Ligand binder design. Structure first.
Ligand code: ATP
Ligand code: ATP
Ligand code: ATP
Ligand SMILES: *[C@@H]1O[C@H](CO)[C@@H](O[C@@H]2O[C@H](CO)[C@@H](O)[C@H](O)[C@H]2NC(C)=O)[C@H](O)[C@H]1NC(C)=O
Ligand SMILES: *[C@@H]1O[C@H](CO)[C@@H](O[C@@H]2O[C@H](CO)[C@@H](O)[C@H](O)[C@H]2NC(C)=O)[C@H](O)[C@H]1NC(C)=O
Ligand SMILES: *[C@@H]1O[C@H](CO)[C@@H](O[C@@H]2O[C@H](CO)[C@@H](O)[C@H](O)[C@H]2NC(C)=O)[C@H](O)[C@H]1NC(C)=O
Ligand SMILES: *[C@@H]1O[C@H](CO)[C@@H](O[C@@H]2O[C@H](CO)[C@@H](O)[C@H](O)[C@H]2NC(C)=O)[C@H](O)[C@H]1NC(C)=O
Ligand SMILES: *[C@@H]1O[C@H](CO)[C@@H](O[C@@H]2O[C@H](CO)[C@@H](O)[C@H](O)[C@H]2NC(C)=O)[C@H](O)[C@H]1NC(C)=O
Ligand SMILES: *[C@@H]1O[C@H](CO)[C@@H](O[C@@H]2O[C@H](CO)[C@@H](O)[C@H](O)[C@H]2NC(C)=O)[C@H](O)[C@H]1NC(C)=O
Ligand code: NAG
Ligand code: NAG
Ligand code: NAG
Ligand code: MG
Ligand code: MG
Ligand code: MG
Lengths: 306, 306, 306
């Protein structure tokens, strides 16, 4: 019957396509973005204090940056023939010392030598002090702090539009003692690591003890057709590895690096750091709509079809 | 009236959809890209000369790489109880020295000690020589130079297509003394930093003195349906942070890193570098069109609807 | 004739749009991904042995990481006035020594001095031992090994869906001696570098001797409408620079970095490493489909038009 058809013709276009879907909908997916991240704060580890240039492994301050929370340090690693402390590689003869396994110290030379007094392991060639990743080192519990400053600037090239999250209404006096809280200061770009993990929804102790990646997505669903001040950034913080993390193997994200030094000598040595950190990832996504000319007649024709 | 309808039926399809819009329009957004960037040149700073392995902080040579233009260097930073040179933290008693503020040197121990002769500041624990970011250090004015070599290779998997910006027509003799200028050599992949900032549209002195990110987009709007040599890369250089830069706080992009050394001793020390640089970002985007079979009948049906 | 039209109405919708194209097709392009890469293995170079913290230049273990295969090492590089070993810069007088060329050692001072006994080259200012990139250093032929562990976790936010490539069915005992082979273990996330280059389709010797980038794409074409275990990752390994590589200039991807040390002195020195490596790139792409409500009536209307 055409009686219901007459109503349903406008119940879908005007109700949803026009008023809700913004029937014009001139989009621009290609948004060019720039993110600058700066970590600030001071932490205590073992018996010393470290700053931004210490727990932040990548100094670029790009959208990807690791905040180290747990360290395993091995100092004065010189090269030579050395045994290992891995109890999973017990040998009593050289026969079970040839190349058939996956050593963690170095290439086996087919020699089972004593380690300290009675522990016999295959002799390896490489850095002598083998790292011990079976000791629960104290976590940098001061890592609820160290604020993060995120400067984001985006451009829509087709619309020529340009906007940054550092609006002129914010001064240095405000930024001196500014936090992030999306009920009273949605706009302040000074995040807190503890606040970030709280918004993610996990306790900070476990994440700092095991490591992970927390993605901070800045969505810009703007309304350029309306006033330009209505395009408001939206911050969403979500764990990324935690989906595949649960309780299976590889219970976190950890990496290994080293610092290389040299005596007044002909030989070098490195200090090895195995770091469990919280690698922050910054992602920028969004779109803008404009009234334009072309989609109006297209939508009119589409309504004519109905 | 059908008289105007007959004309308007083909005025929109043949005029725009067919001839201009390439009605077939078989697209492939998923283009796999590889960018290799190599900076070359030698610069003078203070009283010494540095090369590519010095001002280019990330040695990967990926699409993201910082060209350092200004340095603030603090040498022989040993750990201990030290004061700070920040005049914004004046104290006359220990009462205003407990933890309630945002120190830039280290964790305050609640002790206000003299700095040099009469300047009293809260005693901090950490690296002793505090950095001074209030001195206008000379800018590396030689940074108009240091050419950049960009090797870009892309593949369209659905179309199997493959192309790189290093065409076989270019030899080493040409690349020896080749610049970039999109009127006589659009194709030479040897950019100049001064040329890049000039095409961006800002004076190099201000950018090198404050820092920023300059995105270089390589657009490949190819015409695979036609001859394969007509797919020509287009280079567009645009500032990214400059949108949110203007004259507000945080007037540039700067980072901090350090180099760690160790004496014939039991103690370590680091040299801290606060760098204001021009971080070049390389982005690859584009699409390809093919005649194919499917869209032809779809467009024919769409024309039949009109 | 309507006789063939009646058949062709359903020959295109039911045959292709409905059964094959999954007419509902509720997509989600915005998939949030996290990739953690860990290289393991030990290699022999010159007369020493190196581990993960040595040939893997970026210790972040992100989607982009270089596996160094060939090194050119210059040790004890101190600053001063030094000549160069580049035979392409022969001079017999100071007149052809002013600034008009592209030096590889440093800024020319307009002085042509002897190099060793009879070779005269322009005197440069900078690091004294100039690197020699014209000697075929032995390739790390042990680079067929050093397995790679890739942990990938993805989330579809609109569908709330969440999945990682480290499924609970895999334990540590399996991962201890697990390889990657897409006929018997498609699911094991332990790739082999030799296996990766074999699947790419090039001999490993040439790639390790010249360098390149090998992209590993993990496609997730899931069927969330069906059981969630049917969404199976697909690994595709493809060379990226090899398209623009062929036999033209710049026959590979190489970079330069250095390690900085300091004596018990007032001067510093660096050891320079020119590295030809295989930079692995990890890309994540995919989409998911859901039955939903909206597209059903849209497809019904589209069929009504026919
Ligand atoms: N390339 C690889 N080849 C084989 N096993 C690997 C590889 N990378 C990681 N693994 C294994 O994955 C598991 C997770 O290790 P993870 O990276 O979380 O750190 P870990 O348990 O401290 O071990 P590791 O000492 O091996 O670094 C371990 O059982 C480890 O042996
Ligand atoms: N994590 C942070 N917490 C608080 N304030 C911050 C943070 N990061 C940056 N700021 C502030 O942002 C402003 C811009 O500083 P910027 O990074 O441009 O370098 P700067 O002015 O030399 O300062 P700084 O010595 O703090 O590095 C400063 O007022 C600084 O205090
Ligand atoms: N910024 C640049 N300006 C000029 N020529 C460059 C630049 N970058 C690379 N080239 C040239 O590109 C070619 C490829 O060099 P490539 O990077 O593959 O290493 P190479 O041949 O060992 O040379 P190099 O000693 O210059 O690093 C060389 O002829 C080199 O001179
Ligand atoms: C991290 O910073 C917070 C504040 O930003 C510290 O927490 C406060 O410390 C003061 C110290 O006197 C207490 O009075 C407050 O009750 C604490 N909580 C709050 C909400 O203010 C905290 O000590 C810092 N360090 C760590 C490890 O959390
Ligand atoms: C400067 O302008 C900005 C943008 O409007 C203000 O920031 C937000 O403004 C909205 C107004 O719709 C308020 O609801 C928010 O509470 C504001 N957030 C923050 C963090 O301020 C900002 O308040 C303005 N500054 C002023 C008025 O001093
Ligand atoms: C950067 O390189 C340019 C050339 O590539 C140098 O500029 C020229 O220097 C010569 C020196 O005799 C002058 O004769 C020219 O007039 C200069 N300009 C041009 C356009 O050739 C420049 O000196 C280098 N350094 C800096 C800091 O710009
Ligand atoms: C090698 O072929 C390339 C691709 O055509 C040439 O590069 C451009 O060719 C177009 C022809 O349409 C010219 O208009 C441009 O001026 C060329 N640019 C450059 C930088 O050369 C290139 O010229 C060819 N090399 C030759 C003929 O020696
Ligand atoms: C890389 O590892 C492979 C095995 O993963 C080594 O190849 C085997 O070495 C044993 C040594 O006794 C031989 O018996 C086998 O025939 C070799 N091949 C295979 C397929 O097992 C190889 O030696 C290692 N190193 C290099 C440089 O390839
Ligand atoms: C655990 O479940 C996974 C997911 O099904 C199994 O992995 C694959 O399962 C498919 C079943 O369709 C097999 O065809 C593949 O051969 C399996 N691949 C691998 C590497 O195992 C896995 O087998 C299961 N583990 C068990 C049953 O122990
Ligand atoms: C380094 O110094 C030690 C003594 O501290 C010495 O035994 C060793 O031989 C030196 N290394 C080299 C390469 O000479
Ligand atoms: C480092 O050397 C200095 C003397 O130059 C000495 O005072 C200091 O105690 C040494 N550090 C350690 C940890 O022994
Ligand atoms: C470094 O030590 C050498 C001797 O090994 C000396 O000639 C030189 O002057 C020292 N450098 C400085 C800056 O004193
Ligand atoms: Mg382990
Ligand atoms: Mg400051
Ligand atoms: Mg060369």
């Amino acid at each position: 019957i055409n009686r219901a058809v007459q109503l349903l013709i406008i119940s879908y276009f005007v109700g949803w396509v026009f008023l809700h879907e913004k029937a014009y909908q001139v989009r621009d997916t290609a948004i060019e973005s720039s993110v600058v991240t700066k970590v600030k704060g001071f932490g205590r580890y073992a018996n010393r204090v470290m700053d931004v240039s210490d727990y932040v492994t990548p100094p670029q301050g790009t959208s990807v940056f690791v905040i180290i929370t747990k360290m395993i340090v091995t100092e004065n690693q010189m090269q030579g023939f050395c045994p290992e402390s891995e109890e999973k590689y017990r040998c009593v003869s050289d026969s079970q010392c040839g190349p058939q396994r996956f050593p963690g110290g170095g290439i086996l030379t087919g020699r089972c030598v004593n380690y300290s007094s009675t522990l016999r392991t295959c002799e390896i060639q490489g850095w002598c002090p083998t790292e011990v990743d079976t000791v629960e080192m104290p976590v940098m519990m001061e890592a609820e702090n160290f604020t993060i400053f995120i400067k984001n600037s985006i451009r829509f090239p087709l619309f020529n539009f340009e906007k940054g999250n550092l609006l002129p209404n914010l001064t240095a006096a405000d930024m001196k003692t500014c936090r992030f809280h999306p009920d009273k200061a949605p706009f302040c770009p000074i995040l807190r690591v503890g606040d970030v993990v709280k918004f993610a929804g996990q306790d900070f102790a476990k994440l700092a003890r095991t490591g992970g990646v927390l993605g901070i997505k800045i969505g810009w669903v703007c309304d350029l057709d309306r006033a330009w001040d209505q395009c408001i950034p939206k911050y969403s913080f979500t764990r990324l590895d935690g989906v595949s993390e649960k309780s299976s193997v590889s219970p976190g994200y950890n990496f290994r690096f080293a610092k290389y030094y040299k005596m007044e000598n002909g030989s070098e040595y490195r200090t090895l750091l195995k770091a469990f950190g919280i690698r922050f990832d910054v992602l920028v996504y969004g779109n803008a709509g404009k009234f334009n000319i072309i989609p109006t007649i297209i939508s009119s024709v589409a309504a004519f079809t109905s």
